């Protein structure tokens, strides 16, 4: 189990963020675009899902709700376990760090790591 989005999810949320075609192709290949806004597509996407607040910080309640909505095959216990761990790490991260486009990938990595610990 990982946090990867499906092709279709990427297409839909990518287009909701007005992705350029070239960037979109890259994101669908699970790589990070090198363009100024392409590298921020993941941030834009997960923010529309409510996983992050608008300042970029981790949204605890919004992460829980989004996990339940989009990964409903995971039990609420498993959702809460990985949420509780990642949230606590996110309390250590300042305003200037959460503002970076890379922070979204750091959050997804935390989740993926907690998923592998099962």
Numbering used by the authors: 1 to 118
Authors' description from the paper:
There is good evidence that aphids, like other insects, use OBPs to transport semiochemicals across the lymph into the sensilla on their antennae and deliver the signals to the ORs, where a behavioural response is initiated. The two OBPs also have some unique structural features which are different from other classical OBPs. There is a significant groove in the surface of the aphid OBP3s (indicated by an arrow in Fig. 2) formed primarily from the N-terminal region of the chains and parts of helices α1 and α2. No significant internal binding pockets were predicted by CASTp37 or SURFNET38 for both MvicOBP3 and NribOBP3.
However, the interface seen in MvicOBP3 is not recapitulated with NribOBP3. In contrast NribOBP3 binds to Eβf with a lower affinity than does MvicOBP3 and has even lower affinity to the pinenes, which is consistent with the fact that N. ribisnigri does not use pinenes as its alarm signal. On the other hand, for NribOBP3/Eβf, the Eβf interacts more weakly with Tyr30, Arg4, Tyr105 and Ala109 with fewer contacts and has only one direct interaction with the aromatic ring of Tyr105. In contrast, the MD analysis for NribOBP3 shows that Tyr30 is not significantly displaced. The most likely explanation is that Tyr30 is involved in the crystal packing/dimerisation in MvicOBP3 and is relaxing towards its probable monomeric conformation more like that seen in NribOBP3.
